[PDB]
């Protein structure tokens, strides 16, 4: 039986409240096992299941920083995207990412993931080959030309290939 | 290699507050500030994820930073001291790679 | 934490050159090799994100990656006079960081 892992990072800029509404939620197989609401009184990745308890504060520590980091990414890119498309600074928008690894039955990766969607509509996504991308429109095209030169694929490939999977296994063993 | 730093060389007096400036054209979001003492390892002091971000590096003590815009990144020395003298490098990068500038050979005086 | 064993390495003009480098990380990181020419900033010589453990670089420079020995050793077939400078070995498994190593002052003859 082939298992899987998935994370969904969602941002939402708007009027007034400058800093976007960050929502990082991750699923193992198809169950929620970790959340991160920028709206919480104290932002931080927390377990959504008992078997996630067995994790040294070290884990929850840097794992949260990553988040704290993505926040900045979203607040920064949600801006440039509002530019690629020529919209108003006041208008509210949403930038979402998704990634993860789908291990085969033997354990080795069977499918990687990495994709971004701006305001519901797809934008850019890494193909099954983990080597080529697929743009949606003009702007998505842009990001894909530079990402193609900068060898974006290989970058995410490093994770999706080993790192991610070696961890999905690290999780499965807690249950 | 379109990241420029000014002045090429600066002379700080003990106590004084010096502010090194940076300017890029790589339209990069991530910018950084490394210091290279005696032509050895450069260490990160401060860096920004984007205009308006300020993240302490591995040695921000005595340092302040500002990211007022896409390309302008300013590193500030609260109060210059001997041990705070070296060649500072300002880099930019769209994740993964980093493009460094010419640097700024800043020297402290007592 | 990256570590370049030799800080001072010199070879005669034309001879081959190899600069070692070891990284102590929980897993597969991103390895680079920046060269710094006196009175200038570091330059990106070559990089390795994922794929061929053998990467190519500007000016007949190439490095090999090994998860087994956990090293990213650099090499150049024939080093001319111009190659003399300091070579750094950086890694990054944090947010676009780039922790360098002590480096190595390569000298020719």
């Amino acid at each position: 039986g082939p298992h899987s892992m998935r994370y969904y990072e969602t941002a939402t800029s708007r009027r007034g409240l400058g800093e976007p509404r960050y929502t990082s939620v991750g699923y193992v197989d198809d169950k929620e096992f970790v959340r991160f609401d920028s709206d919480a009184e104290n932002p931080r990745y927390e377990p959504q299941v008992p078997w996630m308890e067995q994790e040294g504060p070290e884990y929850w520590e840097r794992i949260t920083q990553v988040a704290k980091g993505q926040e900045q990414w979203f607040r920064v890119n949600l801006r440039t995207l509002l530019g690629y498309y020529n919209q108003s600074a006041g208008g509210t928008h949403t930038l979402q990412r998704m990634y993860g690894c789908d291990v085969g039955s033997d354990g080795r990766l069977l499918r990687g993931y990495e994709q971004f969607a701006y305001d519901g509509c797809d934008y850019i996504a890494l193909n099954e080959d983990l080597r080529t991308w697929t743009a949606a429109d003009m702007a998505a095209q842009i990001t894909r030309r530079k990402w193609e030169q900068a060898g974006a694929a290989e970058y995410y490939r490093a994770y999706l290939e080993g790192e991610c999977v070696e961890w999905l296994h690290r999780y499965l063993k807690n249950g | 290699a379109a990241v420029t730093q000014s002045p090429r060389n600066k002379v700080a007096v003990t106590g004084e507050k010096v502010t090194l400036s940076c300017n890029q054209t790589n339209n990069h979001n991530n910018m950084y500030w490394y210091r290279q003492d005696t032509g050895h390892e450069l260490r990160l002091i401060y860096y920004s994820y984007g205009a308006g971000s300020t993240e302490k590096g591995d040695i921000p003590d005595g340092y302040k930073a500002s990211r007022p815009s896409q390309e302008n990144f300013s590193l500030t020395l609260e109060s210059a001291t001997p041990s705070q003298t070296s060649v500072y490098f300002c880099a930019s990068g769209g994740g993964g790679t980093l493009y460094f500038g010419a640097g700024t050979r800043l020297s402290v005086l007592s | 934490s990256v570590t370049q064993p030799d800080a001072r390495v010199t070879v005669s003009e034309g001879a081959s050159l190899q600069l070692r480098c070891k990284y102590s990380y929980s897993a597969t990181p991103y390895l680079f090799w920046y060269v710094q020419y006196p009175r200038q900033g570091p330059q990106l010589l070559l990089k390795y994100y994922s794929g061929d453990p053998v990467v190519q670089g500007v000016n007949g420079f190439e490095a090999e990656f090994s998860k087994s020995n956990s090293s990213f050793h650099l090499r150049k077939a024939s080093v001319h006079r111009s190659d003399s400078a300091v070579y750094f070995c950086a890694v990054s498994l944090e947010r676009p960081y780039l922790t360098f190593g002590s480096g190595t002052k390569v000298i020719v003859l």
Partner: peptide, 9 residues
């Protein structure tokens, strides 16, 4: 674990 920081858009 968590995927590294993403490339600028």
């Amino acid at each position: 674990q968590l995927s590294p920081f993403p490339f600028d858009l």
